[PDB]
Amino acid sequence: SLLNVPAGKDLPEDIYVVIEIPANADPIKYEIDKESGALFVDRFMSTAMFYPCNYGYINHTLSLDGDPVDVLVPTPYPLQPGSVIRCRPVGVLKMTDEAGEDAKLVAVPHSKLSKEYDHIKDVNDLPELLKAQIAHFFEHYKDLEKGKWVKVEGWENAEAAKAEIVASFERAK
Amino acid sequence: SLLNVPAGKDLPEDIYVVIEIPANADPIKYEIDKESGALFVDRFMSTAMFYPCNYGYINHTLSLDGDPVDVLVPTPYPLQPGSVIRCRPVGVLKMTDEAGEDAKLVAVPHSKLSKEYDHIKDVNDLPELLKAQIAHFFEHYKDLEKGKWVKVEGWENAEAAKAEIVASFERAK
Amino acid sequence: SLLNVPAGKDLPEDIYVVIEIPANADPIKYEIDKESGALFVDRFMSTAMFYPCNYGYINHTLSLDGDPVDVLVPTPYPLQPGSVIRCRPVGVLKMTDEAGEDAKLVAVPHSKLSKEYDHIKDVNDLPELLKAQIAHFFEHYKDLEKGKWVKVEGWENAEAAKAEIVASFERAK
Amino acid sequence: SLLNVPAGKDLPEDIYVVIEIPANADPIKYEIDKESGALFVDRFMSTAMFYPCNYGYINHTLSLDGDPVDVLVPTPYPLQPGSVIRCRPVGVLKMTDGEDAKLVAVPHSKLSKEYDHIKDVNDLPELLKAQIAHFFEHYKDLEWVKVEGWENAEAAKAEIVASFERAK
Amino acid sequence: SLLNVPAGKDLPEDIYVVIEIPANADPIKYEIDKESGALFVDRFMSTAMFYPCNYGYINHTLSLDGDPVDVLVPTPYPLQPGSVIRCRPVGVLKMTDGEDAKLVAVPHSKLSKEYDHIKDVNDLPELLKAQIAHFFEHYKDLEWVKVEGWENAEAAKAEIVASFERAK
Amino acid sequence: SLLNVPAGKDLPEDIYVVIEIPANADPIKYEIDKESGALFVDRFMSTAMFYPCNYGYINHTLSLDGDPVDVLVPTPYPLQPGSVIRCRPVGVLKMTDGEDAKLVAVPHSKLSKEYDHIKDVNDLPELLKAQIAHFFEHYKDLEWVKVEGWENAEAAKAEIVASFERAK
């Protein structure tokens, strides 16, 4: 089951991300139940927006918010909700919402799966448009939800990202 | 696995439905094997029709036909086969086929996932067109299958639906 | 889980095939991890080609290459990656790659699921165009991958196919 | 522009069919406006059904009901509404609702060889023929038709010719 | 050909809307070239958003900004870019970026009954009305607009009439 | 109407490309009929391959093979068959089957900035350039071509100019 998926081959350089929401999909926010490993519908997004990247999490990680580390993974084509992709950390989007601090990692597919992201070694190597869309997205997707708000603080490098993976992995024990 | 999915949070008001066939999909009738929890192809429908709603079942229920209670769930967008959605009972379509009596529940997404179905508290609140299409569908999808026939008897309220859920849940023990 | 799926109802006549790649899909090569039963992204194909059939494997089989027997399954509509379909053996495509000998079976949906393939009792009954596309595909999909090469040797009948299923099934014990 | 398309290269064997509705598509019934040649939305179908084949007409034809000869064209993939496809007549589904007829035509061999074996109505897959009948029999239920039967390639050609001359 | 489409059967109650952008589609902003009538790619949207409704214009109309009256049309399924749909005005979303207005129209009852109950702007689903405002408010962020509010069916008709006469 | 589209705003730097085949679509080869301007089905491809880019031509051009200059245009999302997109030439893939050439053009900066960095053929992603070569090299296998190589933006412009003047 997805529950048995490893955090990665060689953390924090080599990780697996369990996909929950494909890029460019209909406004359905899926989430993998951590008890059954099944794909649950979290909710139908209220805004007319779509995820700019595939969104998921790293298994066997535990962050301060109590949940696993979530990651955005750009790929040539949208992935199946519930699939596992091997990728590597390149940065982190830092923000704050009605609950407190939030941080989402950005990771690109591993060289074994494609050589299109080999030159992307850090947050500053990602296409600027993409970065702008990701920020804009998180900053506005919950707008039609009363009580929820998001403020994008900024981006951090691969080091900070790998830092979060290792911290959260050790903490998950 | 899907096999471990609960019948619901608070039966019969709050239930989870395991989706097998998305709305508006290609003529493939999927079914979750109750032994493996895997999605099996039951058959390729012979008629040029499509399910008007997402179709699935409530786990941990056992009706008189020997199988779990099946439900039709309307949503804004088609759901992934094998996903679990939290919804609530609003009515039941009663019919008879070559095997005997058959009844399929209609349930709408729970308020947590969307507020579009809050005003739909009973079978009589559902759009008439939708009800007509659901009946028409079940009454004709097996037409090109020799030996199978369906006759729609009628609709019943939320009470009758919740009655079926509770009966079948207790019976599943 | 998919890991618990049987090789078939009555080998080698009646088998189940676990689907990994749907026909006519985007260039993503999926693969079911044999440890978790989860769907992993193997890689993004480099060529501008798509699988002519649904591609998967028979569970509980072990061939000489160390992996389960893989099968190509034509259907009216593309199947969900990770679904299980009941079909029957009609032939085998024989070829050789940079690793050595390779053979892929062709199987058509079982009569229970559809009556469109009943007249297809052997490799020679398959549409010639289809056979040409399958061969062409395997012969060129890895062209943009340095080190990999494929040479199609030829087709064999239902007998040879059933032979491979039985050998690999017994060997998997 | 779509209005300027000919009935075909060589009636009634070789014809051009203007596609209005694609096979396996959403229940939106489009129709080319004979005045502008633009694609109009005729109506949203009310039954949960889809056309088992692409659906269109042969331009420059006039059947007794005042409309051009309409045809169903099976293809390996759905065509674009408003595209034109070269085919050859293979049969006609007769029915009554007055009297109505829908021809079946397959892609001309210049576009594909997948249909060379289908010379007549009987050559068409039984299931396909059965899905077409059922569809036309039931798609207007929530709004009626009775399927009379199938007629041959010659009958199909006869309908094309009559309607074409009749259009002149 | 698309240029030859009329403003409608009976302005301002019964109108034809030429669809340029489908609902829920990829972020590609198309626009019909008023000179050729062909479908041009205006630009690729930079925000991760999609039109909650089909978007187009009423031919033969001229608003103050030199363009025809643009309309948003909700349908059960996305329409084809370049298709024409018969509708009836139900409201207008006002905003400023000069001043801008976007009418909302629903499918004419001849195409569907699903909207007969929507006689006015208030009849439209609150969420739908809220997604339209937010979209127009935020889709050009990465390239600005301020939503003033919603006006009624009468206001909508008034805009159609003025722009139509103004086009003459 | 599609016949009335110009070759571009400013040849050979700024050109309009009429798209006939979308990127990543079903193996249906469409082509705009130069007589009606309607979208015709040329044939159903027999190989399991798809165009890695949108494919079309520059209207009002006449290459030596009697056809207009054909172009491949990479976009973030597949375009609609029959739409027109403003681009700028960046290269040309040469081959022999007589001699054949296919220009590559990217979206004009007015539509997107995602391609401003691609000034020449070498600027195009190696993989993309490699998928285009392989595709044209193998798509007609089940029905032949040999890829000669890639030429620059200047070579591309030269082809546009010659064919345009030649069309006059």
UniProtKB/Swiss-Prot annotation, chains D, E, F:
So what EC number does this one have?
3.6.1.1
Q: Which UniProt keywords apply?
A: Cytoplasm, Hydrolase, Magnesium, Metal-binding
GO MF annotation list: inorganic diphosphate phosphatase activity; inorganic triphosphate phosphatase activity; magnesium ion binding; zinc ion binding
| Catalysis performed (reactions) | diphosphate + H2O = 2 phosphate + H(+)
Which N-terminal stretch is annotated as signal sequence?
Answer: none
Binding, substrate: K29, R43, Y55, Y139
Among CDD domains, the record links this protein to: pyrophosphatase
Q: How does it assemble?
A: Homohexamer.
Q: Which PANTHER family match?
A: INORGANIC PYROPHOSPHATASE
Q: What is this protein called?
A: Inorganic pyrophosphatase
| Organism of derivation | Escherichia coli (strain K12)
